[PDB]
Structures are given as C-alpha cells and as structure tokens.
Amino acid sequence: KETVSSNSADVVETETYQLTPIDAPSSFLSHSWEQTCGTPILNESDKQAISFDFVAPELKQDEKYCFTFKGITGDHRYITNTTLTVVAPTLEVYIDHASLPSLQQLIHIIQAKDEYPSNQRFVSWKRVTVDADNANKLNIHTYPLKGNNTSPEMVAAIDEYAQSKNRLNIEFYTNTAHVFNNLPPIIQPLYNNEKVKISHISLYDDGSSEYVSLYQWKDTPNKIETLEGEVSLLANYLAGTSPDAPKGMGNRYNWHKLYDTDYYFLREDYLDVEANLHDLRDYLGSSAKQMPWDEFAKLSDSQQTLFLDIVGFDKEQLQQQYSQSPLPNFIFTGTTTWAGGETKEYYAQQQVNVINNAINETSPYYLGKDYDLFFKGHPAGGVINDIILGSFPDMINIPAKISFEVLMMTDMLPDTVAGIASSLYFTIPADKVNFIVFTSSDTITDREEALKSPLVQVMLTLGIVKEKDVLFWA
Ligand SMILES: CC(=O)N[C@@H]1[C@@H](O)[C@@H](F)[C@@](OP(=O)(O)OC[C@H]2O[C@@H](n3ccc(N)nc3=O)[C@H](O)[C@@H]2O)(C(=O)O)O[C@H]1[C@H](O)[C@H](O)CO
Ligand SMILES: [Ca+2]
C-alpha cells in the first residue's frame, strides 16, 4: 500500500510550526525527513525524528521550505510532503465612525481570527463597542478616534508595532467616504520604510452619502480624465514630496491605482443603472465589489453569538417577538428632531401621526394589510422614543441603541419597513420598503422639494422606492 499526503502552510517569522507525518502510524520499520527546497535549515538530528519544530527565520522576503517524510511499515509506505512559506507578520487596521463599515469589518474579524490566528488587529470604531474580553477573543487592541478619524494614538501604535518587527504587512479596513481622512496619517510616516508594505485596502460604503456624492458628481465634465490625472497627486502626497492633495473623488476612488484595493458598494449596480457612471464602473473595474449581506449566516453558531453580543442584539428575542402574533411584522423607523423650532413633543407627535396613518385602513398611506407593530427608535431619540412607544400599547420595542443595519446583516428584517428617511433604507430590499417620510430640512420644505432631492433621485433610480412611496411631513 502507498499513501501520499500533502499540505502547505504559512508560518509567520519567529513562530513555530510542527512538522509531522499526516495521518500515519506512530511507529515505522524505517523513517526519515529530508528538505527538498528552500535554504538549508533541517537539523541533522531531526532527520530521524518523527515530529520536530520548524522555527521560521527572519528574512528579507518570503521564502518557501519544502520537507518530505518517508515512513515504511511491513505492508505500507507513508509519504508526507509539507510546504512551509515563511511570511511577514500582518497587522490589520480598522477605522470607522459609522455603522455599516464597522459591522462588515466585525464579520471579517471573526472569520480572520480563525483563519489567521497570529494576526494582531488595531480597531478604532465609534459606534461598535468591543469590550476587553471580546477584544482578547479576537486579538483586538482598541484605540480612540480623533473625532471621527484616525487618532495620533493609533498612528504611534502602528509605528511602534512596525518598528518591533523585521518585516510587516498592513491591511487597512475603513469607510469609503472618509478614506482620505483616515489612511494618509498612517501611510505617510511609514512610506519610506521598505520593510513595511500596505498589502491590502478594503473600503466600505457607510450608506446613502456615497451615492448622493456620486449623483452630484456624475455629470462633471471630463471626470474620469480628471481622476486619472489625480493619481499622481495622491501618490506624491502619500510619498511626502508634495503638500497638495487630490480634492473630491480623486482622493476616494484612486486607491486601487496605488494599492490592492476593494471598494465594497452597498449597491454596486448603481454603477450599472446610472448611465453617466459607466465610465467610473470601467475605471474601477474588478476593484468594485458588491457588499455581501449573507456572511453572518455562514458563520458558525458560536461565531454568530459573538457578533450578536458585541453589537448588542438579542436576535433570539426578536425572533420570538416576531412570532408572538401570527400577523406579519412592521417596523416603524423613528427619527429625532428636525427643522422648524418646535418642541420635542411636536416631533414625537408628528411621528405618532405617521404611524396612525400607516395602520388606518381608510388612510391613503395604509400599509396595505394588518401588521404587528414594532418600533425601531433613533439611537439619539431620548424622550421622543418613550412618547412614541407609549402611544401604541401593543407595539414592541427594538432597542434604539442597535444600528438598524444589524437587522439586514443578521437576516432579521421584518415583512415591511416604513418611517422617517434614513441611510438605513439603502440596505433594505425594495419589497420590504413600504413608504419613506421626509421631514423639513434646510433643503426640503415640501413634498415636491423632497422628490427632486439627490437622495430621492438616487433611491428612485435604484428602485428602492417609487414616487408614490415618498412622503413629506413638515
Ligand atoms: C442629509 C442629512 O442631514 N443626513 C442626516 C445624517 O447626517 C445624520 F445626522 C442622521 O442620520 P440617519 O441616517 O437618520 O441615521 C444614522 C444611523 O442611525 C441609525 N438609526 C437611525 C434611525 C433609526 N430609526 N434607527 C437607527 O438605527 C442607523 O444606524 C443609521 O444608519 C442622524 O440623525 O443621525 O440624520 C440624517 C437626516 O437628518 C435624517 O435621515 C433625516 O430623516
Ligand atoms: Ca407577528
């Protein structure tokens, strides 16, 4: 009989990998290890060992080391071929002040802790909170933001970490709209350090704002030519040979020209359906990606439990509440206050009026059938949330602190969603969006002005709503 087993593994510099036969007996008539490629490193004594330690050296570049074990018994020959590649350590750096990028990043971190258990992670998130215990579970060190952006504390921590290593790969994960505020402060001081490589950049939309910006930019003359022309502008700024930075889209959608970059779009098809963005679609090419909504469900049960704990969402309870009554489920999305100089109570009352219209079968804006009522208040709603919830005795509360985007991520969207406009509507399937209410703002003071706004024009183009779904409350 002959058995041949093969495997490969990355070994981080200075870490240990145990070479051992794969699925073989513990004892042999004869046996040997030999090294078949890579700089000689096998010790003479280990040739007759069954298992022994490979300690990864510190190198100027990655290198593969190949080892073959041969073991013979009376009726069976066992061969194990193991290829070890010595790699630089990887530091993963996460920066976000919103919700959606942080939530996507958290899923990635949970996966990556299992796939890359040696990697250190530095995390600066404004909305998602990782406590000390969960942080240790995920090899996370948390750092504050400076306002909304990368802190000097984080920059110095990365500098120190880099200094401590023979070589370093850095992976960045951040918010697409604010990439230029977050990455250059880290990239610039490391730029001339040849042992440090920015190995990957992952950029995530945070919501509607990236689409409004694209909408406002789509008719700009010669816009891709201008983008191309600003690549060197970004490059020289990062290299610290010029103080001039690209303005606008040039500091946002040129990263893939300089680094291995993925742009995760919440609605990648916007680049398809909006004809004046076909040129940007082509310019980004394979770097443009669709943000996935189903990765949570592919996590293991224990991993799902960890995600839920960190984001503060009792999914099991909401599942139970959805099933309390056999009616389909409606979530009203609340807001805070808006323009007009009215009292807090006025803003709560207007939202109560909206719900009353929604559940009134004689109203033109009736949801269309009977639903069980659920309330997702704005996190900053305060007493407004209490007033609204208290106005509907059988309405079930979904804790306002939870980012609404957690529901779409965990496949916990209800049958229908309606209420005050928010970025959260950009990640709800059209079939689940009932109506959206726009309130008085500096740019919107009636329904006609709402319909003509960039935000609504984008949602119409994307099919999130039709005009009949767009409502106004002063
Ligand atoms: C153009 C403009 O002024 N945009 C602002 C925006 O800069 C920000 F100020 C905010 O952002 P807004 O997208 O409403 O909400 C931000 C985040 O809050 C959470 N959320 C909100 C409501 C809710 N019922 N459950 C939730 O969970 C979601 O995570 C969401 O992504 C805000 O008040 O924080 O309000 C909007 C608009 O003034 C508002 O949308 C008009 O209705
Ligand atoms: Ca129900």
Residue nearest to atom 1 of ligand 1 (CA): 209
**Same domain for 446 and 297?**
no
**CA of 189: how far to CAs of 161, 186, 239, 456, in Å?**
13, 6, 9, 42
The answer to whether 329 is a known ligand-binding residue is yes
**Same domain for 276 and 326?**
no
Distance, CA of 418 to chain centre: 25
**CA of 365: how far to CAs of 218, 350, 374, 413, in Å?**
34, 15, 18, 21
Does residue 466 contact residue 363 with C-beta atoms inside 8 Å? Answer: no
3-state secondary structure string, the chain? CEEEEEEEEEEECCCEEEECCCCCCCCCCEEEEEEEECCCCCCHHHHHCCCEEEECCCCCCCEEEEEEEEEECCCCEEEEEEEEEEECCEEEEEEECCCHHHHHHHHHHHHHHHHCCCCEEEEEECCCCCCHHHHHHCCEEECCEECCEECHHHHHHHHHHHHCCCCEEEEEEEEHHHHHHHCHHHHHHHCCCCCEEEEEEEEECCCHHHHHHHHHHCCCCCHHHHHHHCHHHHHHHHHCCCCCCCCHHHHCCCHHHCCCEEEEECCCCHHHHCHHHHHHHHHHHHHEEECCCCHHHHCCHHHHHHHHHHHCCCHHHHHHHHCCCCCCEEEEECCCCCCCCCCHHHHHHHHHHHHHHHHCCCCCCCCCCCCEEEEECCCCCCHHHHHHHHCCCCCEEECCCCCCHHHHHCCCCCCEEEEECCHHHHHCCHHHEEEEEEECCCCCCCHHHHHHCHHHHHHHHCCCCCHHHEEEEC
* Tokens describing residue 161: 């970490």
Residue nearest to atom 12 of ligand 1 (CA): 422
Report CA(420)–ligand 1 centroid distance (Å). Answer: 9
Report CA(323)–ligand 2 centroid distance (Å). Answer: 5
The answer to whether 323 is a known ligand-binding residue is no
Q: How far is 461 from 169, CA to CA, in rounded Å?
A: 40
**Same domain for 131 and 84?**
no
**Same domain for 105 and 178?**
yes
Q: How far is 346 from 332, CA to CA, in rounded Å?
A: 18
- Structural domain count of the chain: 3
Q: How far is 396 from 401, CA to CA, in rounded Å?
A: 15
Among the three residues 312, 346, 376, which one is the final residue of a domain in this structure?
312
**CA of 17: how far to CAs of 86, 139, 218, in Å?**
10, 20, 52
**Same domain for 122 and 255?**
yes
Pocket test for ligand 1, best of 384, 422, 453 (most atoms within 8 A of CB): 422
Smallest-distance ligand from the CA of 414: 2
**Same domain for 398 and 427?**
yes
Residues 6 or more apart whose CB falls under 8 angstroms from that of 165 comprise: 13, 88, 89, 195
Smallest-distance ligand from the CA of 331: 1
**Same domain for 217 and 301?**
yes
Strand 63-72 to 30-37 pairing: antiparallel
Angle in degrees, CA 455, 459, 464, rounded to 5: 150
Q: How far is 58 from 186, CA to CA, in rounded Å?
A: 24
The residue whose two tokens read 């697409």 is 176
* Tokens describing residue 374: 């659920």
Among the three residues 282, 312, 342, which one is the final residue of a domain in this structure?
312
**Same domain for 327 and 441?**
yes
Q: Which residues line ligand 1 (CB under 6 A)?
A: 99, 207, 333-336, 376-379, 403-405, 420-424, 439
Residues 6 or more apart whose CB falls under 8 angstroms from that of 322 comprise: 329, 372, 414
Q: How far is 291 from 272, CA to CA, in rounded Å?
A: 15
- Residue 27 identity: S
- Could you tell me the CATH number of the domain that includes residue 222? 3.40.50.11120
Strand 372-376 to 396-398 pairing: parallel
Q: How far is 154 from 143, CA to CA, in rounded Å?
A: 6
388 burial type by CB count under 10 A (0-12 exposed, 13-18 middle, 19+ buried): buried
**CA of 162: how far to CAs of 71, 89, 118, 465, in Å?**
43, 10, 15, 48
Pocket test for ligand 1, best of 318, 423, 442 (most atoms within 8 A of CB): 423
The answer to whether 106 is a known ligand-binding residue is no
Q: How far is 334 from 348, CA to CA, in rounded Å?
A: 9
- For residue 42, the tally of other CB atoms under 10 A from its CB is 17
For this entry, resolution in Å reads: 1.7
**Same domain for 303 and 342?**
no
- For residue 111, the tally of other CB atoms under 10 A from its CB is 15
The answer to whether 327 is a known ligand-binding residue is yes
Range of the domain at 67: 1-88
Q: How far is 122 from 170, CA to CA, in rounded Å?
A: 11
Counting other chains too, the contacts that 350-353 makes at CB distance below 8 Å and 24 or more residues apart are 350/439, 350/473, 350/474, 351/384, 351/388, 351/419, 351/420, 352/387, 352/388, 352/391, 352/392, 353/473
Among the three residues 270, 289, 312, which one is the final residue of a domain in this structure?
312
Q: Identify how the structure was determined.
A: X-ray
- Could you tell me the CATH number of the domain that includes residue 54? 2.60.40.3010
Q: How far is 452 from 440, CA to CA, in rounded Å?
A: 14
* Tokens describing residue 409: 């991520």
Nearest to 211 by CA among 164, 176, 180: 176
Does residue 104 contact residue 264 with C-beta atoms inside 8 Å? Answer: yes
- For residue 3, the tally of other CB atoms under 10 A from its CB is 14
**Same domain for 468 and 360?**
yes
The answer to whether 209 is a known ligand-binding residue is no
Helices 383-390 and 344-359: crossing angle, nearest 10°?
30
Residues in the chain: 474
Does residue 119 contact residue 91 with C-beta atoms inside 8 Å? Answer: yes
Smallest-distance ligand from the CA of 401: 1
**Same domain for 148 and 180?**
yes
**Same domain for 71 and 95?**
no
- Could you tell me the CATH number of the domain that includes residue 467? 3.40.50.11110
